């Protein structure tokens, strides 16, 4: 019945992400690119938390390290990148 | 067997994403956006591949069916938002 | 799940099957031939849960799809034959006496 | 491509099992319980072969051996159960006519 719990966790993890996805989809649908940047951090960290399910479940010790390193880097790049777009968006915006 | 095979594949998948991730941040940093837009579909594919691993390590095949459907929806919404944006970036770009 | 968790499940699944196999084989060795039919469905479901171990872990979604389809057919067929033979027996027997 | 090969073999195995299950079914449906005991051995052998897929990919070698023992024991109980049943089925359909 760690089996049953492992299933609730996993389902829960995806439910939380699809949920953030949907609210973001509609905020963006209405063009509120503002209510969006805050949902972003919560979204990434749900994603981080779900990705960790598989990593922590890995039997290799060295490998678990390496992937958490890589996952952190992936997220921080998505962050920087998104900041960047936000940077140009605001630029163009100002101008018009 | 499968444990070696599983370790090789998980590493591979993270390297792919991170590589695309890194390729895309320099394009962003360098303002070459349209070139950035190009990788996003590939990047989103690597992420899907990686996610499917978690889903496959779930013994409830009915639950796998559910998560695959939420996986597809999540990505879909992702694609839809990134495009909503390219548009607002141009509604501004040209105008 | 992790390594320990997969091993317990795998071993556990085989314990279920073998333990059912044993109960039935003992009914068999001495009448209780209908008492056997009861265990049969439970036996078959333990077998389905074991087969599924390999299926659910499969990369190819296309293949995972199709293996599940074939496993349910295999099981439904095993169920239908065993009925047919129970029926044959059931029949042959009442016939005589 | 290990994945590809692994997938063919797994597919092939289930294909082999289902084919054998389908041939047995129709034989049962038209009541040719003769041609049946034969197909059965080959079918249990295909089952064995596919069950070993899961066993062999298991990291614990101690576990591989236990499972193989249990697998073999399961298959022999199934055979014995069935051998014990032809015996009774044939014993009936003779007494009559």
Curated annotation (Swiss-Prot), chain B:
GO biological process terms, semicolon-separated: bacterial-type flagellum organization; negative regulation of bacterial-type flagellum assembly; protein folding
Residue numbers spanned by region Required for homodimerization: 4-53
Domain of life: Bacteria
GO cellular component terms, A-Z: cytosol
Region feature (FliD binding): 63-95
Subcellular location per the Swiss-Prot or TrEMBL entry: Cytoplasm, Cytosol
Chief location of this protein within or outside the cell: cytoplasm
Alphabetically ordered keywords of this record: Bacterial flagellum biogenesis, Chaperone, Cytoplasm, Repressor, Transcription, Transcription regulation
Function, in words: Dual-function protein that regulates the transcription of class 2 flagellar operons and that also acts as an export chaperone for the filament-capping protein FliD. As a transcriptional regulator, acts as an anti-FlhDC factor; it directly binds FlhC, thus inhibiting the binding of the FlhC/FlhD complex to class 2 promoters, resulting in decreased expression of class 2 flagellar operons. As a chaperone, effects FliD transition to the membrane by preventing its premature polymerization, and by directing it to the export apparatus.
Subunit structure: Homodimer. Interacts with FliD and FlhC.
Family: Belongs to the FliT family.
Entry protein name: Flagellar protein FliT
Residues of the full protein shown: 1 to 92 of 120
């Amino acid at each position: 019945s760690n089996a049953m719990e492992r299933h609730q966790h996993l389902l829960s993890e995806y439910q939380q992400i699809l949920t953030l996805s949907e609210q973001m989809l509609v905020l963006a649908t209405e063009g509120n690119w503002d209510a969006l940047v805050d949902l972003e951090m919560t979204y990434l960290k749900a994603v981080e938390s779900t990705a960790n399910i598989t990593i922590s479940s890995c039997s290799s010790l060295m490998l678990q390290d390496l992937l958490r390193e890589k996952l952190r880097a992936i997220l921080d790049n998505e962050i920087e990148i998104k900041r960047l777009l936000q940077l140009r968006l605001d630029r163009l915006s100002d101008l018009v």
